[PDB]
């Protein structure tokens, strides 16, 4: 009855997308000049972690980053001099996400304890202490991103995202609609949108203010593990477990480009873009990152030197450096 | 080429390096045990015997060895996307009830709890992240199992059991049918124990199995293995 109505509605959506699409990105940008071979070297190695790193986030100052691992430590890194500004002893060792506030004042962490902890870096007493224990999730906190100094959008293992309010400790909007465990979210530059890929092989856009699911994107196969907006916020790339990164489209709603090779078979853990947006870096599971010409679907470089699986990969705001964490307790900065 | 503030920043980073090295060296002496199985499988009994949402942590000491238990009964999500966080586990404590062979599971009222535990053991043994790590198999509710096999035979679970209905060979058959699923026996050892009301033997079995795993790891370190 109504199931057939939903199926024919989805068929109408697919037919509308196929009617709207008339020329793919590869056909329309085939005449552009490729970047060619791109060589990056490990300028800095941020040693100091004594367990497997999961997530890192850069800073708006483009010099401080932060990274979380399984030793119950979250370290802020002075990436210019390879220094340790702070080291937070976490209460929960199992954390798959860490976030750096755009004001540089707070840091975040979360993982299998289902809690998005917030820490104050600029405390008057000097030491970094807890400010808010954001309880209210039952699944594992897979991603967290500071909307601003007072709000934070999180994706969890209970198939629901949550825009929080740090000044009250309770959510204001719950983003429901995924049929599967949402694994990563990315925040738009205009701060009023965010997309989140999930284990149902779909990435769903949401409005931060109201919570309506504006679009869904069902192009992948296995399950989404990586997501990142374009710098202009009109696209976003999704790395999943079928060894394919797919560029998407906020306006056209189709899949634009596919970034896959036959030599690579394992999935993607993290993705990030360059400032121009022409250089999408995807941290694969084959012990090395890849560099993809985001306009030609070609491979331009490999960021090797990791002896274990690359878990996190962040490109800094001024585009200078790409810090790539992995499971071998190291973060390597590329330039 | 460094200012005084940069020198003090470098010295602070060195002090943080020393503290992190001390913390990591303290944590590498810990033993990481992953708890798996249904919650009604004597998990409360084993945690209270070992002591006396998310993950409850149990830190207990027994003869100069530090233990950690990561019960994941409250993590009702997809295990495929977070089971790779437990690579460095000394053992996996896998509690499976014995008196669930004839009790029907509440989900769909068609499947049995014993065979669901068998499928759980299949998914835990045959996944990629647990290949060379041992599994401390526990079998639960021995007296309830005795009463239930006195009341009704084991053929109501499956009639493939050719033996007579006595506890010793019936439990031996269910242990063998649980252990022969292990695809690799050269690298992995399953340590089966029938849980008892005595609070010493239950933790002594875990101590012995973990010590055997530590012996194997030290052989791998020294290169003899």
């Amino acid at each position, epitope marked *: 009855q109504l199931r057939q109505e939903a199926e024919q509605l989805k068929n109408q959506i697919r037919d509308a997308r196929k009617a709207c699409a008339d020329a793919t990105l590869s056909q329309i940008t085939n005449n552009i000049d490729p970047v060619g071979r791109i060589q990056m070297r490990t300028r800095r190695t941020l040693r100091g972690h004594l367990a497997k790193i999961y997530a890192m986030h850069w800073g708006t100052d483009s010099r401080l980053l932060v990274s979380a691992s399984q030793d119950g430590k979250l370290i802020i890194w002075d990436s210019y001099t390879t220094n340790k500004v702070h080291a937070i002893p976490l209460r929960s060792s199992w954390v798959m996400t860490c976030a750096y506030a755009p004001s540089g004042n707070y840091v975040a962490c979360g993982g299998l304890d289902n809690i998005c902890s917030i820490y104050n870096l600029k405390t*008057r*007493e000097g030491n970094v202490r807890v400010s808010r224990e954001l309880a209210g999730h039952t699944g594992y906190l897979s991603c967290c991103r500071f909307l601003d100094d007072n709000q934070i959008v999180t994706s969890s293992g209970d198939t629901t995202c949550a825009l929080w309010d740090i000044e009250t400790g309770q959510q204001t909007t719950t983003f429901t609609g995924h049929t599967g465990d949402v694994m990563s979210l990315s925040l738009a530059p205009d701060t009023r949108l965010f997309v989140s890929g999930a284990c149902d092989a779909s990435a769903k856009l949401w409005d931060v203010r109201e919570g309506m699911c504006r679009q869904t994107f069902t192009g992948h196969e296995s399950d989404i593990n990586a997501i990142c907006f374009f710098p202009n916020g009109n696209a976003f790339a999704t790395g999943s477990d079928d060894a394919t990164c797919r560029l998407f489209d906020l306006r056209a709603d189709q899949e634009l480009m596919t970034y896959s090779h036959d030599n690579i078979i394992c999935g993607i853990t993290s993705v990030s873009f360059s400032k121009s947006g022409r250089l999408l870096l995807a941290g694969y599971d084959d012990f090395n990152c890849n560099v993809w010409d985001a306009l030609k679907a070609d491979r331009a470089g490999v960021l090797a030197g990791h002896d274990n699986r690359v878990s996190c990969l962040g490109v800094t705001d001024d585009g200078m450096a790409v810090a790539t964490g992995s499971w071998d307790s190291f973060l390597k900065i590329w330039n | 080429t460094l*200012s*005084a503030e940069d*020198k003090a*920043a470098v010295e602070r980073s060195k002090m943080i390096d020393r503290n992190l090295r001390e913390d990591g060296e303290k944590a590498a002496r810990e033993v990481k045990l992953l708890l798996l199985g249904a919650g009604e499988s004597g998990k409360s009994t084993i945690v209270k015997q070992m002591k006396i949402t998310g993950i409850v942590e149990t830190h207990f000491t027994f003869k100069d060895l530090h233990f950690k238990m990561f019960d994941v009964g409250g993590q009702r999500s997809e295990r495929k996307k977070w089971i790779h966080c437990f690579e460095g586990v000394t053992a996996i404590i896998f509690c499976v009830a014995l008196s669930d062979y004839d009790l029907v599971l509440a989900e769909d009222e068609e499947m049995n709890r014993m065979h669901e535990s068998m499928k759980l053991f299949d998914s835990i043994c045959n996944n990629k992240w647990f290949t060379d790590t041992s599994i401390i198999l526990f079998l639960n509710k021995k007296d309830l199992f005795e009463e239930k096999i006195k009341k009704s035979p084991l053929t109501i679970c499956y009639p493939e059991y050719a033996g007579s209905n006595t506890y010793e060979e019936a439990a031996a058959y269910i242990q063998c049918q649980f252990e022969d699923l292990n695809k690799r026996k050269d690298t992995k050892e399953i340590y089966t124990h029938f849980t008892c009301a005595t609070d010493t033997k239950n933790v002594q079995f875990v101590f012995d199995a973990v010590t055997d795993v530590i012996i194997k790891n030290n052989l791998k370190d020294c290169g003899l293995f």
Partner: single-chain antibody
Amino acid sequence: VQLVESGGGLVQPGGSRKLSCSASGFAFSSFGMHWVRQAPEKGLEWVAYISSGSGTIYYADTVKGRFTISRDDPKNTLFLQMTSLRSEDTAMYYCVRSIYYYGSSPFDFWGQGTTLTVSSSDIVMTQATSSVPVTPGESVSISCRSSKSLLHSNGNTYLYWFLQRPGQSPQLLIYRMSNLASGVPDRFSGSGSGTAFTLTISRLEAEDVGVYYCMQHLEYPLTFGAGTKLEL
């Protein structure tokens, strides 16, 4: 944050006196510590410094080997044991909180102070003016000169502005030539270039009355300016 000192009073010359700044209300072990003197009529002069974890200790050249500075991290206590007190030891001492990482604000808390009166190649900082007659409501520029460029190769100009209101301890206004300390109103603003230090105070009020000190931190020993006293 609260740092209170003890162990003052009149001392016989050639004698000894134990100073103790019992820090409380903050994580003492993560903060480097200082002692900063002040003559009964003149400005400030730096005395000694101990790093967090006692890694590096620096002394003023006038008291190098005469003063010993130590810390007791479990007790959150600072110390300054003094021997053979001379004629220029009649002054008063401040225990200064400081911290050094990227984006830190060192020299930002100061103790209340204790008084000790005796009985009968450095970058010299010179405040060009000494006093300015200023009514509340107009912008004032405080000029301090330097004998060396404080702009290091990393891009930081290490200049530290202080405000010592009459009857109380100095406090930070500008750290590293451009950045306002915590609790400092936005009307304060330091700007300039090498060896040219101007502190502009738009919309002056009655709380700006006091002596303004320029300090260098590019190297050691730390040297203060003469000080510009502002009165209405």
